[model samples]
Target: GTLTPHKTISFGSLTIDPVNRQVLLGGENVALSTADFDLLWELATHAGQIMDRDALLKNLRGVTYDGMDRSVDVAISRLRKKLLDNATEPYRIKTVRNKGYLFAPHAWDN
Candidate 1:
């Protein structure tokens, strides 16, 4: 369980450092809000797992993202922009229609 400084995923100039909590778009750090960071961290860490909004919300400090609470979706949208991943043709986070979201298997650094 050694956390090392590594960039195992890349899209154009975007790179993610899971251990250091660093994200670089080209040469600049992607300014992530607290919520966005949490959302991204959870999904990225458990890449390939289909996490529903409730599960994500629960993992993210028990915050609820049901119905009116689209904060998770909003946070994910922002993260995608930083990672240069499209929501429709997601290269990282993807939607499972009515199910929830899934961090694509290919996005994993391991």
Candidate 2:
């Protein structure tokens, strides 16, 4: 629960209840790990906005990425698969070339 715990965010077909650590996509429950859930909650809250690696890292684990951290990339990759995004061309969570990651809420067509 990084932000306000009482908040229940919903956009497109996604519903995230951070206080309870619950997430539902397209009316289906998405079982995610604590790390994945935290990442998703952060990205989804900031959907359509670019979040840099350092910022994400700090928020996720209270640490900073110093050029060697690779957890963010791996976590994103896992989340994409779990959410059923196209691996070849991901639209939900996109890597904006050095700009960090961007989550597109409108891309959830499920």
Candidate 3:
């Protein structure tokens, strides 16, 4: 819980309860790991902004990317599943070739 524990954030149909580290999608709770939850919180906080791997890694584990690490990518893939975001045609978290990942705003609503 990076932010205040009492805060509950909402983006479209997604609701994030920080205190309990709970995520509810369209009224159903979605289970997520601690790492995944932290990652999701970072992404949601920077919605519509592209966050590079190094920055993301630093936020998640306080380390920098070493050019071959895939932890962030893997975590994002798993997170997409939890969010019900299609991997092939992801409208929520998008891969920006050679750049970074973007958390698309207005992509959730179900």
Q: Of the candidates shown, which would achieve the greatest TM-score relative to the real structure?
A: 2
Identify the superior model by TM-score, candidate 2 or candidate 3: 2
* Descending-TM-score candidate ranking: 2, 3, 1
Q: What is the total number of backbone clashes in candidate 1?
A: 0
Q: Tens-digit lDDT track for model 3 on 27-72?
A: 5777877777777778777766777876776777875445534777
Model 3 stretches with alpha carbons more than 4 Å out:
1-7, 64-68, 85-91, 105-110
| lDDT (0 to 1) per candidate | 0.62, 0.68, 0.66
After aligning candidate 1 to the native by TM-score, how far in Å is the CA of 73 from where it should be?
2.1
**C-alpha TM-scores of all predictions:** 0.60, 0.71, 0.69
Q: Candidate 2 regions off by >4 Å?
A: 1-7, 64-68, 85-91, 105-110
- Candidate 1 C-alpha lDDT tens digits along 1-110: 94334446444334566666767654567788887767656765566677776677666567344553477777767776666635434455556777877655555543
Q: RMSD in angstroms, all models?
A: 5.6, 6.4, 6.1
Cα lDDT of model 2 by residue, 17-58, tens digit: 856678877667888777778887888777766777666766
The C-alpha local distance difference test score for the whole of candidate 2 amounts to 0.68
